[PDB]
Amino acid sequence: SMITLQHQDWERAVNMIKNIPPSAKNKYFQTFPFFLLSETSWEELLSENFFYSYIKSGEFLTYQENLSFYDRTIQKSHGAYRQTRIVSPIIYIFLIAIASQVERIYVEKRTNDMSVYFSGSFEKEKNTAHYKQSYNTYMTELNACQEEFDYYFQTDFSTFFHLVDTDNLFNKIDRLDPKSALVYSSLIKMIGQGRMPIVDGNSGLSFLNTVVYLDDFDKEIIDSLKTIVEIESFKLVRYVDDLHIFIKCANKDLDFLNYKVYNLLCEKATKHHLEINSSKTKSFTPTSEDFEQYFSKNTLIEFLDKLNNMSVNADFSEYEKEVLYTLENPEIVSDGSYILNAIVYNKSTWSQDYDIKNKISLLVNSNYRKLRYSAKALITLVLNTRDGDIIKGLLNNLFTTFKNGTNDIIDEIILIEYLVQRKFNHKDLMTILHGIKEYIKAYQTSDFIKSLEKNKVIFYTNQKEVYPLISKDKILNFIYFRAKYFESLDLVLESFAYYKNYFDRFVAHAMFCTGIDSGRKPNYKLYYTEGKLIDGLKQLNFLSSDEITKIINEAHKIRNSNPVSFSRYRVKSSLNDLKIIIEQLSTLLQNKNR
Amino acid sequence: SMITLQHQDWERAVNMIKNIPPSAKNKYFQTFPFFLLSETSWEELLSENFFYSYIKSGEFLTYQENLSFYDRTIQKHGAYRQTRIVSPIIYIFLIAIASQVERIYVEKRTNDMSVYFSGSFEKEKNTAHYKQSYNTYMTELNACQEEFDYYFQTDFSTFFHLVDTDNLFNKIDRLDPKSALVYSSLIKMIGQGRMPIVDGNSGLSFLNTVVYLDDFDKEIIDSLKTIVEIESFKLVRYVDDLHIFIKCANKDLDFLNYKVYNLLCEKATKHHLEINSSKTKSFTPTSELSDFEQYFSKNTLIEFLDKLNNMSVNADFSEYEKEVLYTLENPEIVSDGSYILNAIVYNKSTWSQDYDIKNKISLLVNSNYRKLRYSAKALITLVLNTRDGDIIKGLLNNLFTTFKNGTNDIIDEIILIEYLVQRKFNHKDLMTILGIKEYIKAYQTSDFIKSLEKNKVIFYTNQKEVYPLISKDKILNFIYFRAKYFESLDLVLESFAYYKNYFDRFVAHAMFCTGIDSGRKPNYKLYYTEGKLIDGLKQLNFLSSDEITKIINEAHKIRNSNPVSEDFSRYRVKSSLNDLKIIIEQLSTLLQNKNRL
DNA sequence: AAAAAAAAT
DNA sequence: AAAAT
Ligand SMILES: [Mg+2]
């Protein structure tokens, strides 16, 4: 009733993550907690008992573990900062479940003149939350368009996710229930502190931003391209924000087509609040544009030498020009980054050469900061040496900088990349363990389904019987979620209005628990007035009658002046008073004795 | 008081706009309305009665003229800046918001830094134009050149569109949360949910530069002081543009470039700022910072118009800048042809009247006027500098042909609006040409203060007297403003809940106004429920008695299931809001009828 | 050199 | 298994 999500969507979401090969779940930070999941813990996820009582009831949006998010900076391919947000494993499923419901009820506007792919696939019998299957199919079609058509146009959007209007995204889904779209958009915006976050690899946000949000824009490009008579045929292929425009035309019309198509892209992008990446956009280009023999171990030695002699103050431009180009073989068709990844993932024994392992040791001990140019590949290169003195040396060099206080964001990314590749080893964690450190201790060492059932609160009535009405309340769970949603954005007016409703209803629940109100269902409406609140709270024998009248009278003075239904400090002070009462009214209920 | 804005803040906002020179007022779209304002209209804007009865009461947020915003694309490297055109009253309010913030905000940055924005709040130099601050900014850049050794330039990409308006107003500690709600929601209403770009507005320029960037700017100041290789440093800022002047030894330049640049990238990411990489240059020596007919002549302009006419319209901005704009450059002066072209159209107006020059300009506007899109503002001035009727009217006729044929695109709109602004909205051109055009008719043609009072709704009671309680209702006005704010964002649940509250209070006023309800104040509380609300609408005898029952029944059905107060879709909610809106239109029309019943 | 103004954002 | 946005 509150979330229109069906169990089939949550099931689909859980199945896409489970379908990821176990040898792939533990290569990423965000998918590692699912790698530690037992088979019995999986069965609980797809079980409808866990869905209707914890997911659909909104109970999961009432625990601080599911409303807490963390910052994590990852490295861009060419040396930029991609700021991401880390969410709890439960929230990671919910984002995919939302996309599962949207895929069922959204009617696409783009025609079959264009193929679309994202970091996932809802294709039947091939559901997966990973990018390999979709990206491989994406690159296979780019080759098909490479042979069929003559020229291609490539465009891209800058800061795509951060410029997405989350409210506008959910508004273009007609058959989406507005009461449910309010819950979805609030959670997503809460992850991004008001804007569309970057949950790296999350197919939920990938599908929503590529298939739904870009639908209107892609449709106008398709329709306008048909009016151009100079184009014989065309085909569009898109991966998230990357777009390829293959066409068939005469060479004599290439100039006018470049003028027509580029102005068509700019006009429509500005129309839909999209910013075209001028750097990553090229004009109409012709479609044409033993491994130990192409790249030997000597070519790898020159890489470490040019890198070990390069100063640590060199930017990415100096690293990519000298060091990375050393790997490119004239006869081979690959960049310096692609060849480097092929060595660490296939020629793993090369790091055990006497010369290579020694040149590697010089890198880690001289300055580990040189690892920042390719953190994933270079750390794998270090770990491929299989030498404990080097592996423990890189960790201790990181530990010394974190011990002093000079640890910036570069020391962080190297540390997190190191801890993920070593599978969050217990000995490494005992030496390191703030912010992201809390998520590592919380979900990266245990089964979060087993820890979910242990840390569950339980209320006991006067007859020492379990009270299950609070957690199953589809009104209390969502009013509390909205009160926390506005609190994270520091919007104290709307946050007080919602929490005051949660306060009156939770008080009405503690009455049915102690047997004071002995009706069919709890009397929620009775405690909306001031006279019934301070009288019932005093009847609970858990607070002083002088303080109770001091808090609710002040809180009533705020509700009668709240323009949502007096400084931020005054509102936050009365809200903190309402929270302390709840924390004591809660601890009073779990005590079966008296 | 639903906004804590003071009269001094509004007075300041109107003064800095008035302080703009007239010959600069008539140069921009947003400020041209004020160029037509009579002196009595200026007196009214500063008058105490106008502020308390129209601004601080929220009455201005209940007229469609102040809640209607239109898109407009201005020219950048040949990119698109999507702007949002606001009403003249709204243009002042954003500036008045900045005035209250300037009085109560405490800057965290120190005097190691100099911050400028598009305007000024200086004691004796209040101005809403950018020429004053930009000249002071250019002067400080020259002083910093003569004293420091190297400078580091930085810039933010999509700076305005990446700002979080809610977080911005949250760094203003002394701003009350209730006024911050109105200020934030109105700004987000203009930008359709995000921070907009109102062309040249000092109010948004001040907030995003002085307040939003404060946390980032102080972090750089504190971190630069810890670098022992930096002897001294001074920081200069203009909106998002930033210069880091330092004094140091040449031997530490490599370490300082790596230290300063990475610190910039780290803290910018921390505050959700996207650093522009194309405009960020490393530590460059200060010496590299940027009689007329002796260098540039009429022949230089003849060579410019020649290559422009030989270049095909299919050419892009790079081919224009490299092949055409280069002919204006001189190998003795460091200057882009853009700055040279601006000097010719603005200081050599008579050059466009030369015989040879005027013929190639006519050839430029008769072959394909879409070649003007490369330098829309400058090349239009070049055409208007010819003072030729057949040439200037020829450009208007070609634009009218592409608009009558229905084949006009965004490029033709940019040339058309810039042409209409540069020709000062000529009467003959307006009759030939005519959403953005509606703003032209409503504001760019006459005194908008005089038109404001001639189009004010007047409500008559049953005794044929004026009913003045609706306009002065601070509660009704702001509730209506929130309903139209959520409606603009297409958020049906919040828009219905606020409009229903506005609907209940408006009917309560119509009940007192028509004499059905007696006493001192209208009985607002009695019309909050289904039953009494239907009876009051039946009593007025202006709608079908059955349709009132169906509309209110469905309206209260939606209210009882609204989670912000299933089977309720977006369409169903929007239909009930429309029926509620339709009833108000009939109720309002009936109220401005003196001799009725 | 002046529709003492446009050109920066 | 990693190497994509
Ligand atoms: Mg609300």
Numbering used by the authors:
A (entry chain B): 0 to 288, 308 to 451, 456 to 587, 599 to 627
B (entry chain A): 0 to 75, 77 to 290, 308 to 451, 457 to 587, 597 to 628
Quote from the publication.
AbiA, AbiK and Abi-P2 are abortive infection system (Abi) RTs that mediate defense against bacteriophages. What sets Abi RTs apart from other RT enzymes is their ability to synthesize long DNA products of random sequences in a template- and primer-independent manner. AbiA comprises three domains: an RT-like domain, a helical domain that is typical for Abi polymerases, and a higher eukaryotes and prokaryotes nucleotide-binding (HEPN) domain that is common for many antiviral proteins.
In the crystallization trials, we initially used AbiA without a tag. This protein did not crystallize, so we used His6-SUMO-AbiA fusion protein, which readily produced crystals under a broad range of conditions. We obtained AbiA crystals that diffracted X-rays to 2.8 Å resolution. The main interaction interfaces within the AbiA dimer are formed between long helices from HEPN domains (residues 510–540 and 565–585) of each protomer. The RT-like domain in AbiA contains palm and fingers subdomains that are found in all RTs but lacks the thumb subdomain that is present in canonical RT structures. Similar to AbiK and Abi-P2 (25), the expected position of the thumb subdomain in AbiA is occupied by the N-terminal portion of the helical domain. Therefore, in our structure, we built DNAs with arbitrarily chosen sequences. Tyr130, Tyr134 and Tyr363 interact with the DNA strand through stacking interactions between aromatic rings of the side chains and nucleobases.
